[PDB]
Design a protein around this ligand. Sequence first.
Ligand SMILES: N#CCc1nccn1CC(F)(F)F
Ligand SMILES: N#CCc1nccn1CC(F)(F)F
Ligand SMILES: [Cl-]
Ligand SMILES: [Cl-]
Ligand SMILES: [Cl-]
Length: 163
Amino acid sequence: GAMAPSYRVKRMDIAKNDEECVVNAANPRGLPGDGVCKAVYKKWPESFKNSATPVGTAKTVMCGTYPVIHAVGPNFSNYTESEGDRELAAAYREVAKEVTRLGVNSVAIPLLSTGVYSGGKDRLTQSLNHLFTAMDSTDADVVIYCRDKEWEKKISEAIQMRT
Ligand SMILES: N#CCc1nccn1CC(F)(F)F
Ligand SMILES: N#CCc1nccn1CC(F)(F)F
Ligand SMILES: [Cl-]
Ligand SMILES: [Cl-]
Ligand SMILES: [Cl-]
């Protein structure tokens, strides 16, 4: 575990993370995809061997000894708000199980279902609160990655609010 488990936020490409493992915002088919998933495919392509997994699940594949946790959030274009919310919460619970199983002291994690799977809505708060619900009982240092300047400020505020 980390000596004083923390949350932090950085605005940069998650493929350049300084953590012991990474969470990919994967598609269910283990395809290269776009956005975070394509950056992850370029950096860790070996981790896409048998990475296909259903919505609401996470599947870890090693790239050398570096773990890539493929977490499949729902595409809100296809799910109802209710069913999508349930699958988004479930994907983060499976990430917390994998992080715990791996025994890592730190994890890099993107906000699932906030980009091309958002169904054109702002889901920062919804996705971040499901992240916290899953990760708060873990003792890994969590570093959240984002690309937008206003999102960095909102995520930083949300972390600081809990102290
Ligand atoms: N509503 C929305 C999408 C949005 N705007 C700025 C950042 N984001 C998240 C995203 F970049 F799409 F992943
Ligand atoms: N069939 C479907 C998707 C759906 N139904 C109601 C809301 N949504 C998602 C969206 F509104 F696009 F975010
Ligand atoms: Cl960058
Ligand atoms: Cl997405
Ligand atoms: Cl972002």
